[PDB]
Paper text:
The most widespread of these mechanisms employs a “controller” (C) protein encoded by a gene downstream of its own promoter, and usually co-transcribed with the endonuclease (R) gene as a single transcriptional unit. The C-protein binds at various sites within the C/R promoter to regulate transcription of its own gene and the associated endonuclease gene. Unusually, in the RM system Esp1396I, the C-protein also represses the MTase (M) gene by binding to the promoter at the transcriptional start site, denoted OM where the C/R genes and the M gene are transcribed convergently from different promoters. Flexibility in this loop is very important for DNA sequence recognition, as it has been observed in the nucleoprotein structures to adopt different conformations depending on which operator site the protein is bound to.
Since the resolution of the diffraction data from each mutant protein (1.5–2.0 Å) was significantly better than the previously determined native structure (2.7 Å), we also crystallized the native protein and obtained crystals that diffracted to much higher resolution (1.4 Å) than the published structure, to permit a more accurate comparison. Overall the new triclinic wild type and mutant protein structures closely resemble the original protein structure. The side chain positions could also be placed with a higher degree of confidence. A large number of crystal contacts occur through the C-terminal tail of C.Esp1396I and symmetry related chains. This gives that previously flexible region a high degree of stability, allowing the complete C-terminus up to the terminal carboxyl oxygen atoms to be modelled. The other primary intermolecular interface is centred on one of the SO4 ions. The SO4 ion essentially bridges the gap between symmetry related chains as in this region no direct protein-protein interactions occur. The wild type structure of C.Esp1396I presented in this study revealed further details including an additional, third conformation of the flexible loop region that was subsequently observed in several of the mutant protein structures.
Numbering used by the authors:
A (entry chain B), B (entry chain A): 3 to 79
Write the structure that this text describes.
């Protein structure tokens, strides 16, 4: 769905804005690198707990993450 | 965390706003009643796909759901 694609898009977009590799985000989020690469391809099985770990590894607040997601849905769906 | 608890809270609040039982939401969302009850107690392991199923069963937009979650975090965290 658009939602599942854009959860993945927003993760990747923030990661790269911050100059972080997948390897860096894995370390900071406490999730292994293959998990990160998978959820950036398809977010279907990403859990709320893992998403919170990823937001902490990205050093973005949940509010800001969710607001970027909403903007992506409004402007592109 | 506050986020995991408020995901649970917002699901449940919208459910009651729509006048639905857990069994009603289970049938509409394609997730069984023990999964619904469980995620309303603790959203840790709720997935993005299951959250989309639940939003469809609640007949609420993803944008409305995430805006209600942002409002709860801003005002109460």
């Amino acid at each position: 769905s658009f939602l599942l694609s854009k959860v993945s898009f927003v993760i990747k977009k923030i990661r790269l804005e911050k100059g972080m590799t997948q390897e860096d985000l894995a370390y900071k989020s406490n999730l292994d690198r293959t998990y990160i690469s998978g959820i950036e391809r398809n977010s279907r099985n990403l859990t709320i707990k893992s998403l919170e770990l990823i937001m902490k590894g990205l050093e973005v607040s949940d509010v800001v993450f969710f607001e970027m997601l909403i903007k992506e849905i409004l402007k592109h769906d």
